[model samples]
Target chain A: SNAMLDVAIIGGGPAGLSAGLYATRGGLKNVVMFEKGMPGGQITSSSEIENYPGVAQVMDGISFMAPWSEQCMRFGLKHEMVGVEQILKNSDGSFTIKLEGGKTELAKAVIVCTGSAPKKAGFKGEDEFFGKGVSTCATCDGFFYKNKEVAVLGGGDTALEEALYLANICSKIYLIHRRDEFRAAPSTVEKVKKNEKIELITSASVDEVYGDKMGVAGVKVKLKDGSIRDLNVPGIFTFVGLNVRNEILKQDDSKFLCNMEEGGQVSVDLKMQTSVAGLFAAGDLRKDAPKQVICAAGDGAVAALSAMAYIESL
Target chain B: SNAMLDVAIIGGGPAGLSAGLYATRGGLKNVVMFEKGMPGGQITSSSEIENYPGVAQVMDGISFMAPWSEQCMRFGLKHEMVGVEQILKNSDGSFTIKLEGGKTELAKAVIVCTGSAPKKAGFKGEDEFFGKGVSTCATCDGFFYKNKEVAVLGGGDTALEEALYLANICSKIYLIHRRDEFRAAPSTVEKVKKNEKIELITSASVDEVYGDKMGVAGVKVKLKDGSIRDLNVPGIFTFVGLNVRNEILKQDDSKFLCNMEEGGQVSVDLKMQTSVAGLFAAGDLRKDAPKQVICAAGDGAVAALSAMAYIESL
Candidate 1:
């Protein structure tokens, strides 16, 4: 049965939840929010959040998103916290979504807030020590390193920002990079240089993270100049990069933007709408995504509203 | 003067403020938020908010946005909270904003979170009593009228929903329509019919609001029979009509297609982008606008990020 809903939100994150709340409040009661798991999305995984506009000192991402989740729930939103697998559009303008299992669901509108996953450095224990000591978001985990020392791995803006964020909070920040130069902004380079706590360790790669079950203690770094150093730090922020998940929404009609950047991110328009109608994209999957919970949350609301309008036209 | 900023926000409401926090926390420290007036924009006039996700009880909008504002200040955001009369483009792909009082500001990048305004009723006392006892948004101001008496003026879905929203809060709801019947959805009609608190007073119109300084104390109704009766109450949720205030954005070379069922609001595109480049629009100022503060906040964030990306490309 093809039932036309007022709004459909994809990827349960800050964006999706915001969209659900706003769309429902906007008189679109026939809205559905679908996620593969719980409402937190990628933001749920973060430990601390310093920025997201109106939030207080470095709140937990999970706590940050909880109210948004609860608000949508309070509006009696139709939300399913399960991964969306395959989706097919019918001739009647209805959509059928196949979930992770053999389950299928349908809706007329969709907002894709499926946020990005952090790109791992592919070293041993990198995945094992994740969230324990190896973190992807510096703002989420940098405060834990305050008055202590931490290692930042990467060569991009994310890596540089992590290094900079750590430099302010931690007593010592060792910014390790595989290359001597960073792809971060030139101004950021200047700021990082001016900071006293920041120490740039170029042409270095992590052999393994030395840590315990509760936390990290220290680590070893392999330099490009053929030198090894024993590092004593409590945490590591990995800004290596991310991989955006946008393959599911692209249909044959989405040939205009099929290619992903070397960054593996899904391309999107300003409204976070992808190359398809009735299917909008948001979060880290979209191009140039800030990959922060706030951005993703904001985009989620945008994508949902856009989808609502598209559905209304039909 | 031509230096690029880490994050440049166009509006200083909840969404823009949230984006600033995330951007700054991500180490995009050269953040600047530009508003056309004092911070909090519409939220400042809002008396109390209870539905903003994590916000537990009734709280003032100023207090709600206070923490976010303080964070932006602490992070050294140059908040220019004056009116932006015009946004001019430089040949070199930069932008110059002219403030209301003849002050000029420039930015390397921008976030157009310039929010939308409700189409004023232009009725007697409508403007004079705004936020006192007169409200256009049910989601933002509904709690105050709870267990009281109220009226919704319109035959549309917005009117029905506002009536429903007030039904939960008020002891009595007078739904007044200019026509003999309603123009709302069938399901909404069924929902309204089942609601015990709602009293459908068809073939009527709002003559004027009767109140003093605090807010709309009640209303005087004009019936098709040429009779007028004053129905006293705590407030009135005016859903008789709406329009999107999007005239300034039409100057840009962007294409926006707004969805509408009746009179013109904001004719917009899917991305909330106006018919001009480097300019975007959102909030309660468009066709089929979601008049709720949270929805407007969400759309405001979307517009801001869109302008940010447009500026970034140049």
Candidate 2:
């Protein structure tokens, strides 16, 4: 366990898994991917994924990523089922990865792919029905509700933009917000207001999303005027916000280990290289992420290749 | 077709197919991908592909990309089997795509994924035995020749770097170059000279690569003084150069329609957007491309999403 690894991939999402696969296959013998649980990442919580390029069969996130770990292991990539606490740049230009429970590992290069998570609005039944009928991603699940009525919760730019995106596929959209004014850009708010298929429910918030064993059936909303209303819909999309899981890159003094954006996103070049040498970032944790499975996996591959080059240079 | 398409994806490789899939699946209705033949891209010629994440089954390039076209088509993405001659930006922020045989198509947004081609060394039997032992990409095919003797032909940075990469996997690497002095960086040349597994054959060029139906068997090299030598190797890697397929972006005046690097690679932001609005470039045609199938596919998805946003803004 104390042996120096050629690469340590933090997180087991599409990006981390792809990075591990490429690193081992690219001739790095000692490579490890760390995750607390399974290796599928946030995508595994998705109900049906069909936009991932060559994957023809529309499968759930779990089934789609089931074969990846085995393929990566075939190329001699190891998996460490633990969480990373911190990553520090060593004086010798190497890296010290502090794992949970006081364990530590050394690596010549590191690829951080700790992906972001969509913030939950804390509505009742939201967690239980997630991936069944509740989703946060419009591009991944909106196609499944084609021509059907759906409810959207939020007032941010993502929420308004997704409402507009769903308007092209869904029959109608009920956009609910707690405040009368939206936090999104004025132009997006104007477009959402002008969309005929979208109905704005101002000064209202989702109270509970009741669903059957099959999926979500309806959503209960409480208006600011002490009135309650229900919207019967098969699908409900929540876009409250997203949290970039970049704690591993943060120091105790509040400074990041490398350069970062104002929004806490890691700044990386096209090759996934961070400002710090021998360190890289990939997936949704990076700046301007498209938040797609294929793109994350691609970032992983690029990061692995770059990491290999960096290690070789040393 | 004069009808304005929502998105026009040029080239039918992994990147183009992936872009078509995302563009249509992301709610763009009138999306079409233009390819002269079947869609699969340059990866179709690879002998075996095992590194693409989630694809556990070891298969050839043709089989891996077979389902991609069907999947993209399922989402209403049309495929136009015609070569694109030029893509001209219109005055109204649209695009005019000139097709082969004087045909024309209009699109609100354009994604260029024409991809790059590895330059051949023009040796005997090189074309006939490609993917069957004679290869260009060291990362994709080097692992297949693990512990086996192989020959690499080139004199540039990519050549020497790939030779060093192959040294870890292959037992012996005969680095054959035509010049006494390498065109690679001094540090890389020094590293290559120091690696015990690498045997540099300076001032020599490959004359012929004779192979059986199963695969490559041996290679003949001619020294500068006309002395012929033979190396019995199962694989040979040619790293002469790469040509970015960005002709469609070039105007008749010889100036490119968008910003480009000196190497003819299109300059794109992280979202795959080119300098020209509503225009995007992905895959190996873009600058700093990793040139992997998965990376290209990811670029396609990002380009499609960006194109959708561009169209929506208009």
Candidate 3:
């Protein structure tokens, strides 16, 4: 791009879109948000979303985020349907956003909202049955399996915590783990052990999640002792881990563009400012993110305001 | 009031409402949100709201928050139509929420979202023409006065910053202060002096704001020399300060129930947790709040999640 943008937003999730809205509406001119595809973030793949506060209707994620782009863009935010390769901080404290096809765009300030994705458990039919009968987020989809039996696959803190959460609503929970030892806090493990509805299936791994056209019908597990068992459940939840989309912040010299946590989350303050001046991060890519759409949107607003102040200071 | 709530949320603003939604939906069985009146909070007085992300329609604050109660209530969040007098932390880490009419409710955890209010300048017709021709927040109302002349009252940082913000949108801004010197930073004063659209009216105070049924018509300023001059501007923005509603956290012994900032805003971490165990704060009542509805809602969600984790640990 010829003209230097006031702010360049990387990613088009709720965080990036909200940043664009606030920056442009707050009187920052020449703002751009880059996304490889149409803007709806990872939430677009969700089956249903009812936790977003002001929205009363219980709708799918796509319908929930359908109006965001229109509302944000009305405030003079531009969208570039291209992927971002890297973000390099120049000597003048500005940023150069490397785009696809060897093109580059410059901006006075930058907000990185590249959201993270849940790592898929590569079992047979896990991908094919996602959003149909398999899911990653227990908070978003737990209520659907109310009074029904469900299978949980993981050994980490998130997995145990979510299983404990589901124990209150679901009739029964099969917590399947590859190892006998749980990688969660002892307190959580004790609680899970005491819960009557939770059944721990240790030293086992999921072989396949066979489902019908309606949804998941059952899950097959292969044990360490060379035995196979079938769990007749309607739903399965996987909590392996998350892959933070932070590759753009990595330089060819093996240096990061900004300070980040060990797990690749961008370090941010209360205002969503990163370690570098005029550089901000928000949403799931930021440290201690709640990973909710509303939280991401809030981070975007805060980051945009911070970026505006940084630009004004310069 | 008889049952011990899983979480007790004070102030039914966007933050409290969002916290209630998340807490209940995340599997906390008992949750209650207390408000003195119908649960719209201070935002109900706003004439228009367009900055909240995902909400496309440009409507008044009442309409914007009309569906929040219903949506949050769907997840089993109860509402108590009463004022919260105080929140006392029990020895066992629980909380006692003192309500109006000498009633008390118990909760395992507490989330305080008692929002703040902008201090009003008690000039004549200032209250009478509020939201009609007089306003407080520039970010919320500056665009409506595009290319028009406006008057701003106050001598603080917020006053100068908002005036500068309005200068870009409005044709002219009269920064009227009662004192010769500004209470704001020297850099901000220098910028205001350098801005061509901003005219300083120091040693002058607003005597009255005169307007017809259509809205504000003019403002009469009384100078230090007893000379009166009328500013023919349609809008006037007053930015004196804010009154944080933190009375509930006060103790009769002249101490606070939790840690607070010098300005009486509740001190909270990034997760919205207060210094006291199992007590949290969100929204404008918390320190460093962006004072936006979306940001408050996000804080509520984060606080609720933190409260849930606390309850689980207990």
Candidate 4:
């Protein structure tokens, strides 16, 4: 059977959809998009999307965001092949994708738009108040507290480092660490110690949060000595840590091409390309990847385009 | 005290806004965008943006897309930083950014949104010959060749592609590729092959891209099998490649530096980033980067948003 396309997308998130828009517009046809779950990516879970380019006021996922699947389908995009496994570059410059469901396909170009997953806090109000007042990315949330106070949760290097990021925009930053010792680099730790704006509140964990109509007002924390205190703040940033989509990447090519941070996140150039020739990573799946839909979509565009060239060159 | 910002973007081109909209909207508010020129980067030069997301009809540079700057500034925008240099990450994860023209800012993260410049193909008498016979960018130069037969240089797809782009406007197109095997995709080759006016000359190179004061008249020719011929044609478009903006990047440290192609373009990821950790590249500077404005804007967005996350991590 003739089983090839101009481009094949691995996932059906914003990135993949954006790729479809681009690849199709660039005069490439026979595009296919695949995903294990439904579309909308991280934005699907968000209650409101006020930051998307066209969306100025607060709008829910239904109205504010692009219905990514529809967008891809608008240009006659193809469907996902269930259980796809291996993708190998062939000698003839084509690619063969091995599917776990025992299907295969080939293509001249491939856009790996497999976006990253968000690391959620398992606490009670975590999912309830996600975009409301709690955020995993400090860059995305710090602006909301431009002059207001906020608390950063976690004990690792990333947590401490994110607290510093929050310190730049938030009125006052509270560094809540479960451990007394930090895992951050010595220089990073030293810089935090010397900064006047940051205050290290070690040996602490958030017990509960307090808020009313205006969103989260503050959080109730339990100190190491079993003491409780309320830190009134407008926002709370959780920089504890994350796992990029390295799980699947680790399975196949051990010496993966994607650039990896010393901390184990995927490394990439400005275009969101990993060390791998054809593989491109975007969104939360990358090292130093910002957990934002716009960022992921943009990263997806870059990856898809770059991958297009790689495919074209082949 | 409130925190400054983690990410600082320089321009609002596809690379910039794509990054800003992605990072800030994705929830990286610390992302700041600066533009000395204007929005759209090289795309501003484009007559129409045909490939950007979510648009049915062709749109002008500014009008073809949504209001991204509005969304970016609402979150955490620091107008146009214009000329920039030395974005040093602080130990505390703040960035110490230097702006040209004046002022120095700081961030935990740094994304170099320094895009690339279009290059002029070097032909014999090119210095004394600029605007005389040799030129780059087909759209910018195609108008000058009204009702004329133009000879184009290079063997890759761009040379033939631009030749086809010229075939419509000009009286004739003398497309010259170095080898019998063309580097352009078969689709492009098919288009050129079918064109009635476009002429493909194989196994030859334009040894001298020279012309007179009247404009490009013809170029000297040399063949690999040692034969010479000068098929006189007017006007020339160098679809060869671009020159990167590597000079601005020497200031930062990276895990790996971008390798320059023979054309002097910077190797980048899907985010339009260089090999450095915090530095990102966009527009013509990127390796294998197409010189089209729409593509460059896409690169700009990816680079800027990626920088936001990198800075936030700091």
True contacts kept of each: 0.26, 0.74, 0.74, 0.23
Cα lDDT tens digits for candidate 4, B160-238: 6577768879999887766887865455678789999988778876677555677666677777777777768666666
Model 3 chain A, poorest ten-residue lDDT window?
A42-51
- What's the CA error at residue B168 for candidate 3, in Å? 24
* Each prediction's DockQ against the real complex: 0.18, 0.33, 0.34, 0.19
List ranges where model 2 is wrong by over 4 Å. A122-204, A207-220, A223-227, A230-241, B122-204, B207-220, B223-226, B230-241
Model 3 iRMSD vs. native = 6.9
lDDT of 3 by residue, A108-216 (tens): 9999999987898889999889998899877678899999999999998678878988898899999999998986545568889999999999999999999878999
Ranking by DockQ: 3, 2, 4, 1
Instruction: Give DockQ: model 1.
Output: 0.18
Computed on alpha carbons, the lDDT of every model, listed in order, comes to 0.66, 0.88, 0.89, 0.63
CA displacement after TM-score superposition, residue B225 of candidate 1 (Å): 8.6
lDDT value, residue B36 of candidate 4: 69
* lDDT (10s digit) by residue, model 3, range B1-314: 66789999999999999999888777788999998888888777555577788888877678998999888887688998889999998887778999888988999999999998788788999889999889987767888999999999999767887788789899999999999998654556788999999999999999999988999999999999999999999999998877899988889897999888988889988899888999999999988898889999999999999999999897
Error of 1 at B157 (Å): 9.2
Candidate 4 C-alpha lDDT tens digits along A239-274: 565555544444454654345688556777666566
Tens-digit per-residue lDDT, A1-314, candidate 2: 66899999999999999999888766788999998889998877655566787777877677999988888777688998999999999999889999999999999999999998799899899999999889988877888999999999999767887888889999999999999888654555788989999999999999999988999999999999988898999999998877899989888898899999888899988888889999999999988998878999999999998998998898
Cα lDDT over the full model 1: 0.66
lDDT of 1 by residue, A1-314 (tens): 25556666777777677777666754576777887777877656544455455556666556776666666666567776667766666677666676787877777766666677777797767888888888887766766777998888888755665576667688998888988787654556888888888888898898888778878787789989778788988788887766777666556676323335466666666566666567666677776665555556556666665776676677
